[PDB]
Amino acid sequence: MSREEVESLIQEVLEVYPEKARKDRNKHLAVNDPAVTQSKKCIISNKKSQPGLMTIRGCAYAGSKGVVWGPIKDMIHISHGPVGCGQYSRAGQRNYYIGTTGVNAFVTMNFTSDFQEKDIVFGGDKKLAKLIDEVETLFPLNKGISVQSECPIGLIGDDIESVSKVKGAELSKTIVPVRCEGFRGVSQSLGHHIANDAVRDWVLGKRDEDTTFASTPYDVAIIGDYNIGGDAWSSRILLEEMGLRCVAQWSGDGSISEIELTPKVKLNLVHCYRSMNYISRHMEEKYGIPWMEYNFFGPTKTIESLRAIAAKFDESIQKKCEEVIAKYKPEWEAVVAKYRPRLEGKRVMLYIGGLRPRHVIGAYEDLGMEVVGTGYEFAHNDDYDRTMKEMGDSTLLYDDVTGYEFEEFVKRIKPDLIGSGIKEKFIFQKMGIPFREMHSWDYSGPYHGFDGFAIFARDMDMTLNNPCWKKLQAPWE
Amino acid sequence: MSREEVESLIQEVLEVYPEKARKDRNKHLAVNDPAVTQSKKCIISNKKSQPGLMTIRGCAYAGSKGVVWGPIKDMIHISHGPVGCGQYSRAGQRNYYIGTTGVNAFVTMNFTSDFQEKDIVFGGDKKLAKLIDEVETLFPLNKGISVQSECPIGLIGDDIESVSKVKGAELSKTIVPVRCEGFRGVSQSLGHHIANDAVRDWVLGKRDEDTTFASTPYDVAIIGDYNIGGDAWSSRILLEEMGLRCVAQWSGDGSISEIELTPKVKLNLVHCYRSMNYISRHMEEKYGIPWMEYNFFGPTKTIESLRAIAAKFDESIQKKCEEVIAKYKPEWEAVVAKYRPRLEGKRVMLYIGGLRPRHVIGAYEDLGMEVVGTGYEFAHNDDYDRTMKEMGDSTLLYDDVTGYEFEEFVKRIKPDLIGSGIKEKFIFQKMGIPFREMHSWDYSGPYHGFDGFAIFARDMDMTLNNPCWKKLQAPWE
Amino acid sequence: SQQVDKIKASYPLFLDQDYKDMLAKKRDGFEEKYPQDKIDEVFQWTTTKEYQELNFQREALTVNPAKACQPLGAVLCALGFEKTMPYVHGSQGCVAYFRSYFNRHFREPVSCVSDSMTEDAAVFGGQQNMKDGLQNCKATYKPDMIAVSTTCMAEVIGDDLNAFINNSKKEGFIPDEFPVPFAHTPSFVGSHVTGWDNMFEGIARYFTLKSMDDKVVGSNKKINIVPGFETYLGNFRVIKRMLSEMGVGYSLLSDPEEVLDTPADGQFRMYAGGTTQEEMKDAPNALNTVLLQPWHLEKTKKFVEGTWKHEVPKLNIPMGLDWTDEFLMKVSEISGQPIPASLTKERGRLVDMMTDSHTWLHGKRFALWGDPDFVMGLVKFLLELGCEPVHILCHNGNKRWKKAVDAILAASPYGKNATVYIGKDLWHLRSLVFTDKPDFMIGNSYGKFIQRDTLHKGKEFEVPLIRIGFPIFDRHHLHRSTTLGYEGAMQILTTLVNSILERLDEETRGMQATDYNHDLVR
Amino acid sequence: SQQVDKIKASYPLFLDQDYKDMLAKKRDGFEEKYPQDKIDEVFQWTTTKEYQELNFQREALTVNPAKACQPLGAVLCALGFEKTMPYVHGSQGCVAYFRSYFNRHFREPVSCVSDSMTEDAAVFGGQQNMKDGLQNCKATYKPDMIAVSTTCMAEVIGDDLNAFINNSKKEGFIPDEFPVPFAHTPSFVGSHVTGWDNMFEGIARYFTLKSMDDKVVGSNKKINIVPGFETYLGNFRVIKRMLSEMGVGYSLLSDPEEVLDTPADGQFRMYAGGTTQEEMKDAPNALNTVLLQPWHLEKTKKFVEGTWKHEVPKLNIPMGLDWTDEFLMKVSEISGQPIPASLTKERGRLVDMMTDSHTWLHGKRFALWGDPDFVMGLVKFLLELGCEPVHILCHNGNKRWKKAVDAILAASPYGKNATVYIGKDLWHLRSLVFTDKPDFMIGNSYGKFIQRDTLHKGKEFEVPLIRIGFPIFDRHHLHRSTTLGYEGAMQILTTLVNSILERLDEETRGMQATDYNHDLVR
Ligand code: ICS
Ligand code: ICS
Ligand SMILES: [Fe+3]
Ligand SMILES: [Fe+3]
Numbered sequence A, B: 001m002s003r004e005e006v007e008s009l010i011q012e013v014l015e016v017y018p019e020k021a022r023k024d025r026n027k028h029l030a031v032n033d034p035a036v037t038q039s040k041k042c043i044i045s046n047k048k049s050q051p052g053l054m055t056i057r058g059c060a061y062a063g064s065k066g067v068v069w070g071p072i073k074d075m076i077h078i079s080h081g082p083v084g085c086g087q088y089s090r091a092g093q094r095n096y097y098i099g100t101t102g103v104n105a106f107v108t109m110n111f112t113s114d115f116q117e118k119d120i121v122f123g124g125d126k127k128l129a130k131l132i133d134e135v136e137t138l139f140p141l142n143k144g145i146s147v148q149s150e151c152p153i154g155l156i157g158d159d160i161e162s163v164s165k166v167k168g169a170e171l172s173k174t175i176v177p178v179r180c181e182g183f184r185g186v187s188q189s190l191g192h193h194i195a196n197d198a199v200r201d202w203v204l205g206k207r208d209e210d211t212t213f214a215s216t217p218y219d220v221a222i223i224g225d226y227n228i229g230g231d232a233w234s235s236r237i238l239l240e241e242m243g244l245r246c247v248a249q250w251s252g253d254g255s256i257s258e259i260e261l262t263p264k265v266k267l268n269l270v271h272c273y274r275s276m277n278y279i280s281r282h283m284e285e286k287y288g289i290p291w292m293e294y295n296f297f298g299p300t301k302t303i304e305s306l307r308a309i310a311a312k313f314d315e316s317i318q319k320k321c322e323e324v325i326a327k328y329k330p331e332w333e334a335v336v337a338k339y340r341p342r343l344e345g346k347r348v349m350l351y352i353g354g355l356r357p358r359h360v361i362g363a364y365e366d367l368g369m370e371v372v373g374t375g376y377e378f379a380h381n382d383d384y385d386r387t388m389k390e391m392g393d394s395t396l397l398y399d400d401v402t403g404y405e406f407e408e409f410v411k412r413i414k415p416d417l418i419g420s421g422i423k424e425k426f427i428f429q430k431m432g433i434p435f436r437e438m439h440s441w442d443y444s445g446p447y448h449g450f451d452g453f454a455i456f457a458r459d460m461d462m463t464l465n466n467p468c469w470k471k472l473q474a475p476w477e
Numbered sequence C, D: 001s002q003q004v005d006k007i008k009a010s011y012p013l014f015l016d017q018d019y020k021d022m023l024a025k026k027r028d029g030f031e032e033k034y035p036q037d038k039i040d041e042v043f044q045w046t047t048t049k050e051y052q053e054l055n056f057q058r059e060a061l062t063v064n065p066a067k068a069c070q071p072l073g074a075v076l077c078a079l080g081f082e083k084t085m086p087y088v089h090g091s092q093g094c095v096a097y098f099r100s101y102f103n104r105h106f107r108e109p110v111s112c113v114s115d116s117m118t119e120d121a122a123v124f125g126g127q128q129n130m131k132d133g134l135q136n137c138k139a140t141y142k143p144d145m146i147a148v149s150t151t152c153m154a155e156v157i158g159d160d161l162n163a164f165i166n167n168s169k170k171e172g173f174i175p176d177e178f179p180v181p182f183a184h185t186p187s188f189v190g191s192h193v194t195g196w197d198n199m200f201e202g203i204a205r206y207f208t209l210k211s212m213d214d215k216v217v218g219s220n221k222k223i224n225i226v227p228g229f230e231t232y233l234g235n236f237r238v239i240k241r242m243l244s245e246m247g248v249g250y251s252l253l254s255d256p257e258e259v260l261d262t263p264a265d266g267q268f269r270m271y272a273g274g275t276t277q278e279e280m281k282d283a284p285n286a287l288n289t290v291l292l293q294p295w296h297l298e299k300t301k302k303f304v305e306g307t308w309k310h311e312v313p314k315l316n317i318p319m320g321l322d323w324t325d326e327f328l329m330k331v332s333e334i335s336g337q338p339i340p341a342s343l344t345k346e347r348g349r350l351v352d353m354m355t356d357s358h359t360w361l362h363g364k365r366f367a368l369w370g371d372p373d374f375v376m377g378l379v380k381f382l383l384e385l386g387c388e389p390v391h392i393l394c395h396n397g398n399k400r401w402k403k404a405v406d407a408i409l410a411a412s413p414y415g416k417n418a419t420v421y422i423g424k425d426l427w428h429l430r431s432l433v434f435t436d437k438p439d440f441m442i443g444n445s446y447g448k449f450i451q452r453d454t455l456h457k458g459k460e461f462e463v464p465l466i467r468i469g470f471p472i473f474d475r476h477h478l479h480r481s482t483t484l485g486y487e488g489a490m491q492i493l494t495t496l497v498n499s500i501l502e503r504l505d506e507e508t509r510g511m512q513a514t515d516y517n518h519d520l521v522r
């Protein structure tokens, strides 16, 4: 669609709103332009949602408990507050891990303080202290505890940092208080930041002067991969085939000892910039560890990343890098040969959280597809800067899109495929538009790396070309 | 019910029949009388069924293929004729066995010549010879073949005996022709007899001049136990605890070598008199092997049988007999103490095939129950002789009962429990009368022996006292 | 031994050590059993392509058939008529088997009589059996109609049913006006579905052949429905429900739904419901006749077209999305009734479920068997779901049918790896699921032994059975299910996707080994 | 690595040797993992009675709850009204979770808005959020009614919903006649079912409290039906079906079955069906009001009795035979309509199925959980089937409810080994199924992790899960099922008996080991 058509579509969609919401939402909708590379000249982001408009966003607790802390497999994470938050989020995110659940690993369990009104009236700090003792008795192999605060904690004036200090000293235990109450910030994003700072303040410096770990010149950490369907594993295997040693994975399949060893690495490899750029900058300031952004979606980006990573080391790693690329060349070329002819020219609209709305574009293009609209629930302008470079000229960009906007944009643009979340999936299927979940991978994946590209391609094809999409209209209508 | 009431019930029920059927059925219905011990003075049996009256009987093929031959596990039994008979009878009878089905054992499979009209016109003897070759190719570990003739074989003049001799000599294989066509006889019974003669004529004498078998004074065979739900195993274990050696089991879990070794035993133990008295008499005539009837239904009969069997041997077996009785005493006494109070005084009507209608009576009485009516599909007068002794004074006796008769008798007598077959089960459940399958044991069992009595008691209680029987009438009617 | 408070049935009783030792002694002492290494070798051989080739060279031996004989279908057809007694002229052993077979599938009484012909009748025929049998049956069980078929003994000796029934009336054994339709049903021709066709055509002839003079096509404004051999109660019910929803006047000809599902209220009801004699007498006055299972209603079709002069529509069995659509559109055309909003919504709800479940169904590979119409409808719906029906077996299929299914397969990319087999049995199918392993079998209870065989090769080779068809003996109340229409498609879809998900849960249930993929949400 | 023609997803990809070797190196190098022998020791300990006693001494820690929070139920209640937007005053993170939780169970869109209160509202309250939120929602999504509940942040800071909504109307953000019923739904009180009760009572109050003067009990000749928190579409449908069969005039108050099952026809329908505003306005004119799930409709009951003056009948949930009987008899009494023959026959068909399957169900032992009314109805039906419900868990149950279930259990010999637990969670239940092992669990998808744990101890300790309840996330389309009435009892019975037979087939599938009991006929 031409820039002029897209701009007209934006204004037509905004006509339904009351004035205040109309003026606000206009600032969060934009048309990509190569002459404007500074996103702060064309789109506003990381602001409050307008009331009543059916934002798709979550809260700070989802950012902290969901991605940063919850996946750390050998800690117990307490959803501290009433029963809702921990139950709705129990095992909804596919942060894959190896462990013996309930014994030495705990990711898919829901530990909670189950606040009742009495806890609102009298405070929950005594309950939290008793709860910690019960955790230690019943789960003796846990290697640390985190306290994920829900909305009431800060509102009633509880002091979980005092409980965490006192109980941690009593039990010689790492107990991490996280003030990620959902009323803080505007979205999941501030939860990331709060959770990063909690890692910094309570865990990361534990081994600052400990020299017992034997480091090598090729030690790296994977920062910001939550291992959805094994995504981080399908990345790690490549980094180590290339001669690197992945000392830590934050946070998918992660462990508290991995976190504590991360200041020993030579390079931090950041996949999800949005959620862990905070701790990466801290580690550079404090420990001198450089960090770099990379992208393991699709062969073009995976190859580019491996080369850029290897270039940070020496000729021996660059040699292994080219050996890895040569090994997998026939594999992804065969995926392209099978599936690109079946997907070439098809147009995709995306809406996801903080990374994937730009990070998966290369993988779609490796299959001959085109992303004609994208947007984020909770990205910041530095994300949109990176997005304008990846997206085509005159494409549609939307920040904190409303349900109404997304539906109306789709009706006009008529994409061949939509990639978004569970709250969107069933709307667009009913409209007859193939849909793929781009958070959960629709219970498939991995999608990272060369092995993940094959699954991604198979999945876009199975859904876009499925026989069901030809059957929505009854033959008598 | 008094004798006079029962006699009046009989006459009232028979008023519906046309004259010819009325006169016939009257001869097959009787009231037990202690002063008349000869069944040939009070009931007719083993006659043709009256047309159109819904007999429960099967045919000679069912008797031959179903019980005598089919359970022999390491032979392949050909249902020779059109596709129906072998398919309706496939794995309907629970003749339990140990083996690798399709490889060295074949009981639950259905091998058939699947006659088409061309086979009616030209005959099936050429098809049978080719079929035998295909069996030998595809099932090389079979240890013998039987040919179970269905109705058309004799009617079109095929000569399966010639095929069996020629192919058996060609292949050095035991191939047994059985002329058990369903038009022969009047019921399953003649199929037993035909099948017994086929064993005699084609298998039983194979080792007549073999002196290699290491015999002992305590060698027996179990004759006429088809191992329903493991019945023969729960009998065998007791005989061998008593110091006996069971050389053979006919035919449940049986094997062709066991049959061939049976003329080497010291005593044939006959459970099902009806189906296997023929070969037992032959073995006494030819080999001098004595035979005796026994009964392993319930503790009273099992104890009596163990003692009677042990009395045929020496003091060492008689001692072990009492040791076995002492071992199981606390077990069956605990069954009686639990279940007899829950069943005492309850009245049962039975209708089964050729043995169990009298053979299970003692087990019911061991739980305080009373069998107020019994009858057989296909028993002979020597069976009814034994039945009049087991059944109480003035009880009802029915031969080849019609569906109408059985329904009307039940309506009047109002038994608390009925034990019969699958074609009867669902009729009486709809009437609100607890029902137990006494052929298949309702997919339970074993019922033989001490271990079988516990299951039998549990099963009569679970059904007779089940909560469902209080709910048949809607509360608004 | 038994502990009174935890009594063991055969399983697990015979796993106790003393029984295990006893069974080992029986084997070693007297069974002269092949060594286990030889048993393993032969088993492995039976899983190979070499064995498969020998297996498919069979010309004379049938093993584990997937069909039954004509009179079984004649009985089911007859049961669908009001106060009608199925009556099989010939040997009584057949009737015991017909009744027990249906007893076990429906878990219901099944009423059927024989006239108990015996060996003597091979000299002189069964006329006297028919005379007394008809009189005895009418007097004792008081049917309003007796529907006569035959067993193979009566066909081989050549009893003339028509003359025998006529002579029964002439000599006073049954009243001349008492309806006794009949059909010859030789078990050595066709299969159970052929018997249904033969019986139905005989009943149709009985009530209409000699009374056509006053009939006018379309004058009663109804559509006749002939269901064929049908063993799911939901299938009779969904057809009646959809036609009533549309406001379409109809007559279901052979309707056993009531007599196969009577309540347990303290009364046994030998008869219940059924197509009335007036409905059969009036059927030539319908607008048309629709055959729900045309590949086993060929004789019925010739009579309906040749004598009633109905222009039977060319419709497939109404299974899956497209063929249910076509059925409703054709009924709408014939009747003048529009497809109502309720059925349009039901269709779109099936489509919704397809979109919801397509990612787990895509590319799944199936072996399946059954009767011809059921199988082709199952194939069609599997293709609509994006599934691959790779081994398609119809023991009682024919060449024309196979051509039709092959054409359906050729029209879909999901048919590229599929082969249609006719005249083959379940021992043939066993080879196919070893040599070209699918994900699942869809079939009747006889498939359980194939699943057992595949597991013995190894867990990774196991092919689980999904029970759809006839007979189903080892589960309870699946005969209440539906396979026709959108409702039946919804039930099949749900069963298929959840069979896939149950198997995945099983394969991912291993603590710290495979449970990384034991997802809460699928 | 991948082979392009047989691509592997996570399972089984990560079982390849290179992935295994990589995961072993990650563990050994950097995870500082406890030794496997120690993991095994602690696992075994967690299966013991000693561990159970410590586990049941918990007072502060909850692990794996079997309940959710109030506003989830308010949203489900609101969805049952025509063109009604659920609206949760407070934090938007809650609403993303409510929507996604229901998305995954129903596989449908779930519409709900937030007014996006943030940290600053702790100073000045959420009044402006309510004003702009109501106006934005009405304009953008064009509901005819907005039904307002709360998240816990708004409850803690103490927002006065009533004043805030009144001020939104006074200041012109929405027209004064636009309906905005509301309820305070604190997540730290009760559970999701309490939120349903609170929301429903608020909607009832909104439409009737101030207009009672012209009402006359019985004048509209109808019976009101309040379903409570209900997540099986079949349960709304069966109640309407049975009442229509009887010719009973009724109003189902909160009816989401249409909006939770829209067709996929090319259009997204945000709203469909639902209870009308007029039905709520007219509801005091009913003969009476029947509460299908009375143990979480206490506030509704007090309002219906205190304000509408209805004499709410003392009825249990209509689950199983006796309680469906009692429901139909009471509806017949109130309405004057007789129970029709069709429902009497349906009842006897359920009884028939009970007689057919009783031998496989007898004595089978179950652990089960769910909401109070659902659990007590399941317990009752299990007793009617001759089953033993040994571990009965209702995390959100109360002492009066426990007394009532204990009395139901004491009245039946099948209740003698049963214990009712309230306030306990699925980590408590995990201990019970180890220390006092039942045959099966009946519960929601969270039970799969208990089954996984039991299998790890050994195959003989595994307790299979039967999925009945909410949420069910790892199977497709079970939300279409029924648990109420005779129809629901038929569905539960069929699921239970065939779960038993599926497990028996699994345990007897072992060639030459256990397949002596692998019977074709069951
Ligand atoms: S963390 Fe973020 S929303 Fe970077 S909160 Fe969200 S497992 Fe999304 S686009 Mo769900 S910033 Fe991860 C994300 Fe991206 S949960 Fe997953 S998919 S890469
Ligand atoms: S053989 Fe006979 S009918 Fe003796 S043909 Fe029949 S497995 Fe019956 S009363 Mo079914 S003479 Fe056996 C019998 Fe008895 S099949 Fe079983 S139960 S003890
Ligand atoms: Fe039944
Ligand atoms: Fe859906």
Ligand SMILES: [Mg+2]
Pocket (backbone or CB within 6 Å): C500, C504
């Ligand atoms: Mg799978």
